[PDB]
mmCIF file of all heavy atoms in Angstrom:
data_model
loop_
_atom_site.group_PDB
_atom_site.id
_atom_site.type_symbol
_atom_site.label_atom_id
_atom_site.label_comp_id
_atom_site.label_asym_id
_atom_site.label_seq_id
_atom_site.Cartn_x
_atom_site.Cartn_y
_atom_site.Cartn_z
ATOM 1 N N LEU A 240 91.131 114.265 94.896
ATOM 2 C CA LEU A 240 90.512 115.444 94.312
ATOM 3 C C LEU A 240 90.503 116.600 95.305
ATOM 4 O O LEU A 240 90.591 116.411 96.521
ATOM 5 C CB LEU A 240 89.082 115.139 93.860
ATOM 6 C CG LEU A 240 88.848 113.850 93.071
ATOM 7 C CD1 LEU A 240 88.407 112.727 93.993
ATOM 8 C CD2 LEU A 240 87.824 114.074 91.972
ATOM 9 N N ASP A 241 90.388 117.815 94.764
ATOM 10 C CA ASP A 241 90.313 118.994 95.617
ATOM 11 C C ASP A 241 89.007 119.036 96.395
ATOM 12 O O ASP A 241 88.940 119.655 97.462
ATOM 13 C CB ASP A 241 90.462 120.258 94.778
ATOM 14 C CG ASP A 241 91.622 120.180 93.815
ATOM 15 O OD1 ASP A 241 92.475 119.286 93.986
ATOM 16 O OD2 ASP A 241 91.680 121.011 92.885
ATOM 17 N N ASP A 242 87.963 118.392 95.872
ATOM 18 C CA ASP A 242 86.674 118.390 96.550
ATOM 19 C C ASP A 242 86.746 117.673 97.888
ATOM 20 O O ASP A 242 86.111 118.102 98.856
ATOM 21 C CB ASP A 242 85.619 117.736 95.661
ATOM 22 C CG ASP A 242 85.339 118.535 94.407
ATOM 23 O OD1 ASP A 242 85.481 119.774 94.449
ATOM 24 O OD2 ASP A 242 84.984 117.923 93.380
ATOM 25 N N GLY A 243 87.514 116.590 97.964
ATOM 26 C CA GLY A 243 87.658 115.848 99.192
ATOM 27 C C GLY A 243 88.419 116.551 100.289
ATOM 28 O O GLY A 243 88.522 116.014 101.392
ATOM 29 N N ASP A 244 88.950 117.747 100.025
ATOM 30 C CA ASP A 244 89.725 118.455 101.041
ATOM 31 C C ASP A 244 88.879 118.763 102.268
ATOM 32 O O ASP A 244 89.280 118.452 103.397
ATOM 33 C CB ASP A 244 90.306 119.739 100.457
ATOM 34 C CG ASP A 244 90.885 120.645 101.517
ATOM 35 O OD1 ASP A 244 91.721 120.167 102.313
ATOM 36 O OD2 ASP A 244 90.505 121.833 101.558
ATOM 37 N N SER A 245 87.712 119.381 102.075
ATOM 38 C CA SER A 245 86.783 119.540 103.187
ATOM 39 C C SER A 245 86.293 118.188 103.683
ATOM 40 O O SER A 245 86.044 118.020 104.882
ATOM 41 C CB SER A 245 85.605 120.420 102.773
ATOM 42 O OG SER A 245 84.582 119.651 102.169
ATOM 43 N N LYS A 246 86.155 117.217 102.777
ATOM 44 C CA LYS A 246 85.885 115.847 103.194
ATOM 45 C C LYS A 246 87.016 115.296 104.048
ATOM 46 O O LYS A 246 86.759 114.639 105.063
ATOM 47 C CB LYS A 246 85.663 114.964 101.971
ATOM 48 C CG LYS A 246 86.052 113.519 102.178
ATOM 49 C CD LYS A 246 85.896 112.732 100.899
ATOM 50 C CE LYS A 246 85.602 111.279 101.192
ATOM 51 N NZ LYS A 246 85.414 110.513 99.936
ATOM 52 N N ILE A 247 88.268 115.543 103.654
ATOM 53 C CA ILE A 247 89.391 115.189 104.513
ATOM 54 C C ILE A 247 89.199 115.768 105.904
ATOM 55 O O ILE A 247 89.333 115.063 106.907
ATOM 56 C CB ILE A 247 90.720 115.648 103.893
ATOM 57 C CG1 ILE A 247 91.029 114.830 102.642
ATOM 58 C CG2 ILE A 247 91.836 115.553 104.911
ATOM 59 C CD1 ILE A 247 91.151 113.359 102.912
ATOM 60 N N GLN A 248 88.877 117.057 105.989
ATOM 61 C CA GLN A 248 88.555 117.630 107.288
ATOM 62 C C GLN A 248 87.490 116.810 107.994
ATOM 63 O O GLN A 248 87.636 116.474 109.175
ATOM 64 C CB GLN A 248 88.094 119.076 107.132
ATOM 65 C CG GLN A 248 87.465 119.637 108.393
ATOM 66 C CD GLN A 248 87.392 121.145 108.391
ATOM 67 O OE1 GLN A 248 87.817 121.796 107.438
ATOM 68 N NE2 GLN A 248 86.862 121.713 109.467
ATOM 69 N N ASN A 249 86.424 116.458 107.275
ATOM 70 C CA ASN A 249 85.334 115.705 107.882
ATOM 71 C C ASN A 249 85.834 114.404 108.494
ATOM 72 O O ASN A 249 85.666 114.175 109.697
ATOM 73 C CB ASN A 249 84.251 115.424 106.843
ATOM 74 C CG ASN A 249 83.515 116.674 106.424
ATOM 75 O OD1 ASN A 249 83.923 117.790 106.750
ATOM 76 N ND2 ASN A 249 82.424 116.498 105.691
ATOM 77 N N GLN A 250 86.464 113.552 107.688
ATOM 78 C CA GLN A 250 86.981 112.291 108.208
ATOM 79 C C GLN A 250 88.024 112.512 109.294
ATOM 80 O O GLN A 250 88.237 111.627 110.127
ATOM 81 C CB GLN A 250 87.568 111.456 107.070
ATOM 82 N N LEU A 251 88.668 113.676 109.312
ATOM 83 C CA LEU A 251 89.665 113.979 110.325
ATOM 84 C C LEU A 251 89.053 114.391 111.653
ATOM 85 O O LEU A 251 89.712 114.255 112.688
ATOM 86 C CB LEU A 251 90.593 115.090 109.833
ATOM 87 C CG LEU A 251 91.711 114.662 108.886
ATOM 88 C CD1 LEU A 251 92.687 115.798 108.655
ATOM 89 C CD2 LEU A 251 92.423 113.441 109.425
ATOM 90 N N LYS A 252 87.818 114.889 111.649
ATOM 91 C CA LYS A 252 87.231 115.390 112.882
ATOM 92 C C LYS A 252 87.141 114.311 113.947
ATOM 93 O O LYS A 252 87.352 114.595 115.130
ATOM 94 C CB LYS A 252 85.844 115.962 112.606
ATOM 95 C CG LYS A 252 85.861 117.320 111.937
ATOM 96 C CD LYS A 252 84.557 118.071 112.146
ATOM 97 C CE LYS A 252 84.659 119.487 111.605
ATOM 98 N NZ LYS A 252 83.644 120.403 112.191
ATOM 99 N N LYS A 253 86.872 113.068 113.545
ATOM 100 C CA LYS A 253 86.427 112.040 114.480
ATOM 101 C C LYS A 253 87.426 111.746 115.594
ATOM 102 O O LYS A 253 87.004 111.472 116.721
ATOM 103 C CB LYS A 253 86.121 110.750 113.719
ATOM 104 N N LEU A 254 88.722 111.811 115.316
ATOM 105 C CA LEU A 254 89.727 111.264 116.218
ATOM 106 C C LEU A 254 89.715 111.952 117.574
ATOM 107 O O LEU A 254 89.483 113.159 117.675
ATOM 108 C CB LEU A 254 91.110 111.386 115.590
ATOM 109 C CG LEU A 254 91.174 110.820 114.177
ATOM 110 C CD1 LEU A 254 92.526 111.083 113.571
ATOM 111 C CD2 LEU A 254 90.885 109.338 114.218
ATOM 112 N N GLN A 255 89.931 111.166 118.625
ATOM 113 C CA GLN A 255 90.066 111.700 119.973
ATOM 114 C C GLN A 255 91.109 110.926 120.764
ATOM 115 O O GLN A 255 90.911 110.617 121.943
ATOM 116 C CB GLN A 255 88.725 111.687 120.701
ATOM 117 N N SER A 256 92.230 110.606 120.145
ATOM 118 C CA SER A 256 93.171 109.736 120.837
ATOM 119 C C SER A 256 94.308 110.529 121.472
ATOM 120 O O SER A 256 94.618 111.639 121.034
ATOM 121 C CB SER A 256 93.763 108.701 119.877
ATOM 122 O OG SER A 256 94.999 108.203 120.360
ATOM 123 N N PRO A 257 94.932 110.001 122.520
ATOM 124 C CA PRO A 257 96.130 110.652 123.064
ATOM 125 C C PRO A 257 97.308 110.605 122.108
ATOM 126 O O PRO A 257 97.876 111.646 121.772
ATOM 127 C CB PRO A 257 96.418 109.848 124.337
ATOM 128 C CG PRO A 257 95.128 109.209 124.678
ATOM 129 C CD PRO A 257 94.475 108.898 123.374
ATOM 130 N N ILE A 258 97.680 109.411 121.657
ATOM 131 C CA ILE A 258 98.813 109.215 120.762
ATOM 132 C C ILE A 258 98.262 108.924 119.378
ATOM 133 O O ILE A 258 97.119 108.477 119.246
ATOM 134 C CB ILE A 258 99.721 108.073 121.252
ATOM 135 C CG1 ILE A 258 100.045 108.252 122.734
ATOM 136 C CG2 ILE A 258 100.994 108.016 120.456
ATOM 137 C CD1 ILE A 258 100.568 109.613 123.087
ATOM 138 N N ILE A 259 99.058 109.187 118.349
ATOM 139 C CA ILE A 259 98.616 108.994 116.975
ATOM 140 C C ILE A 259 99.797 108.540 116.133
ATOM 141 O O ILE A 259 100.911 109.040 116.304
ATOM 142 C CB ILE A 259 98.003 110.281 116.396
ATOM 143 C CG1 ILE A 259 96.563 110.435 116.878
ATOM 144 C CG2 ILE A 259 98.046 110.266 114.891
ATOM 145 C CD1 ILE A 259 95.809 111.561 116.227
ATOM 146 N N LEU A 260 99.564 107.582 115.244
ATOM 147 C CA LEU A 260 100.529 107.213 114.222
ATOM 148 C C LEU A 260 100.019 107.665 112.863
ATOM 149 O O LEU A 260 98.829 107.922 112.678
ATOM 150 C CB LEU A 260 100.783 105.708 114.215
ATOM 151 C CG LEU A 260 101.037 105.059 115.569
ATOM 152 C CD1 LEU A 260 101.606 103.680 115.385
ATOM 153 C CD2 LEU A 260 101.980 105.893 116.377
ATOM 154 N N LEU A 261 100.935 107.759 111.906
ATOM 155 C CA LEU A 261 100.605 108.330 110.610
ATOM 156 C C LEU A 261 101.498 107.720 109.551
ATOM 157 O O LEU A 261 102.678 107.471 109.797
ATOM 158 C CB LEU A 261 100.768 109.848 110.628
ATOM 159 C CG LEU A 261 101.009 110.634 109.343
ATOM 160 C CD1 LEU A 261 99.906 110.452 108.336
ATOM 161 C CD2 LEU A 261 101.143 112.088 109.696
ATOM 162 N N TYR A 262 100.933 107.494 108.372
ATOM 163 C CA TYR A 262 101.681 106.934 107.260
ATOM 164 C C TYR A 262 101.311 107.676 105.992
ATOM 165 O O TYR A 262 100.148 107.664 105.585
ATOM 166 C CB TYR A 262 101.394 105.452 107.100
ATOM 167 C CG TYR A 262 102.207 104.842 106.013
ATOM 168 C CD1 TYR A 262 103.533 104.551 106.212
ATOM 169 C CD2 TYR A 262 101.656 104.569 104.786
ATOM 170 C CE1 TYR A 262 104.282 103.996 105.229
ATOM 171 C CE2 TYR A 262 102.399 104.010 103.796
ATOM 172 C CZ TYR A 262 103.712 103.725 104.023
ATOM 173 O OH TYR A 262 104.472 103.165 103.031
ATOM 174 N N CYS A 263 102.293 108.306 105.364
ATOM 175 C CA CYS A 263 102.077 109.116 104.170
ATOM 176 C C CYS A 263 103.436 109.422 103.556
ATOM 177 O O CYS A 263 104.455 108.830 103.931
ATOM 178 C CB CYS A 263 101.314 110.390 104.508
ATOM 179 S SG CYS A 263 102.331 111.622 105.305
ATOM 180 N N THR A 264 103.450 110.335 102.595
ATOM 181 C CA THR A 264 104.672 110.907 102.056
ATOM 182 C C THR A 264 104.771 112.376 102.451
ATOM 183 O O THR A 264 103.798 112.994 102.891
ATOM 184 C CB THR A 264 104.730 110.748 100.543
ATOM 185 O OG1 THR A 264 104.952 112.032 99.950
ATOM 186 C CG2 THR A 264 103.443 110.158 100.023
ATOM 187 N N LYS A 265 105.970 112.934 102.275
ATOM 188 C CA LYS A 265 106.306 114.209 102.900
ATOM 189 C C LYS A 265 105.352 115.323 102.482
ATOM 190 O O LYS A 265 104.970 116.160 103.306
ATOM 191 C CB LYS A 265 107.750 114.563 102.572
ATOM 192 C CG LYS A 265 108.248 115.815 103.237
ATOM 193 C CD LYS A 265 109.711 116.031 102.923
ATOM 194 C CE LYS A 265 110.205 117.299 103.565
ATOM 195 N NZ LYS A 265 109.544 118.474 102.935
ATOM 196 N N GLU A 266 104.947 115.353 101.214
ATOM 197 C CA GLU A 266 103.982 116.360 100.784
ATOM 198 C C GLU A 266 102.634 116.131 101.444
ATOM 199 O O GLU A 266 102.001 117.078 101.933
ATOM 200 C CB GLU A 266 103.827 116.339 99.268
ATOM 201 C CG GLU A 266 105.123 116.463 98.508
ATOM 202 C CD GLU A 266 105.926 115.191 98.543
ATOM 203 O OE1 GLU A 266 105.341 114.147 98.899
ATOM 204 O OE2 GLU A 266 107.133 115.236 98.234
ATOM 205 N N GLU A 267 102.166 114.883 101.434
ATOM 206 C CA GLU A 267 100.971 114.534 102.185
ATOM 207 C C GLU A 267 101.101 114.947 103.634
ATOM 208 O O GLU A 267 100.128 115.401 104.236
ATOM 209 C CB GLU A 267 100.707 113.037 102.091
ATOM 210 C CG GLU A 267 100.565 112.543 100.686
ATOM 211 C CD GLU A 267 99.878 113.553 99.815
ATOM 212 O OE1 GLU A 267 98.650 113.713 99.957
ATOM 213 O OE2 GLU A 267 100.566 114.201 99.002
ATOM 214 N N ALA A 268 102.292 114.801 104.209
ATOM 215 C CA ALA A 268 102.487 115.198 105.596
ATOM 216 C C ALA A 268 102.316 116.696 105.767
ATOM 217 O O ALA A 268 101.667 117.144 106.715
ATOM 218 C CB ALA A 268 103.865 114.760 106.082
ATOM 219 N N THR A 269 102.916 117.488 104.880
ATOM 220 C CA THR A 269 102.684 118.924 104.919
ATOM 221 C C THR A 269 101.197 119.221 104.895
ATOM 222 O O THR A 269 100.671 119.910 105.777
ATOM 223 C CB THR A 269 103.367 119.594 103.735
ATOM 224 O OG1 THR A 269 102.914 118.976 102.527
ATOM 225 C CG2 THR A 269 104.860 119.431 103.833
ATOM 226 N N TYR A 270 100.508 118.681 103.893
ATOM 227 C CA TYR A 270 99.075 118.893 103.743
ATOM 228 C C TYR A 270 98.328 118.536 105.019
ATOM 229 O O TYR A 270 97.491 119.304 105.506
ATOM 230 C CB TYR A 270 98.584 118.047 102.571
ATOM 231 C CG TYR A 270 97.215 118.375 102.035
ATOM 232 C CD1 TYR A 270 97.050 118.754 100.714
ATOM 233 C CD2 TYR A 270 96.089 118.272 102.833
ATOM 234 C CE1 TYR A 270 95.809 119.037 100.208
ATOM 235 C CE2 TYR A 270 94.846 118.557 102.340
ATOM 236 C CZ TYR A 270 94.709 118.939 101.027
ATOM 237 O OH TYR A 270 93.461 119.225 100.527
ATOM 238 N N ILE A 271 98.632 117.371 105.582
ATOM 239 C CA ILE A 271 97.822 116.838 106.665
ATOM 240 C C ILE A 271 98.120 117.555 107.968
ATOM 241 O O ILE A 271 97.206 117.861 108.734
ATOM 242 C CB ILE A 271 98.018 115.319 106.785
ATOM 243 C CG1 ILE A 271 97.316 114.616 105.632
ATOM 244 C CG2 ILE A 271 97.504 114.809 108.103
ATOM 245 C CD1 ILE A 271 97.548 113.141 105.601
ATOM 246 N N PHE A 272 99.390 117.821 108.258
ATOM 247 C CA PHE A 272 99.689 118.636 109.424
ATOM 248 C C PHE A 272 99.071 120.015 109.295
ATOM 249 O O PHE A 272 98.649 120.599 110.296
ATOM 250 C CB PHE A 272 101.192 118.746 109.620
ATOM 251 C CG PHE A 272 101.794 117.583 110.340
ATOM 252 C CD1 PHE A 272 102.402 116.563 109.641
ATOM 253 C CD2 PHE A 272 101.774 117.519 111.715
ATOM 254 C CE1 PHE A 272 102.968 115.504 110.299
ATOM 255 C CE2 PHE A 272 102.338 116.456 112.375
ATOM 256 C CZ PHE A 272 102.939 115.452 111.667
#
């Protein structure tokens, strides 16, 4: 849902790692990057 977009930001804030892996599809990748 569009409502979870700011929620996506929320769940995204937590990370503090040097390296990162990611699994999605290309549109999701656009969105997430």
Side-chain angles (χ1 to χ4, degrees), residues 240-249 251-252 254 256-272:
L240 314 95
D241 313 345
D242 294 330
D244 169 53
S245 87
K246 151 184 208 179
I247 291 300
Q248 168 163 0
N249 291 11
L251 280 189
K252 284 201 173 201
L254 308 175
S256 158
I258 311 309
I259 280 188
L260 313 194
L261 157 59
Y262 183 77
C263 76
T264 126
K265 184 176 179 293
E266 307 75 16
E267 303 324 286
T269 55
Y270 195 121
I271 287 175
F272 277 98

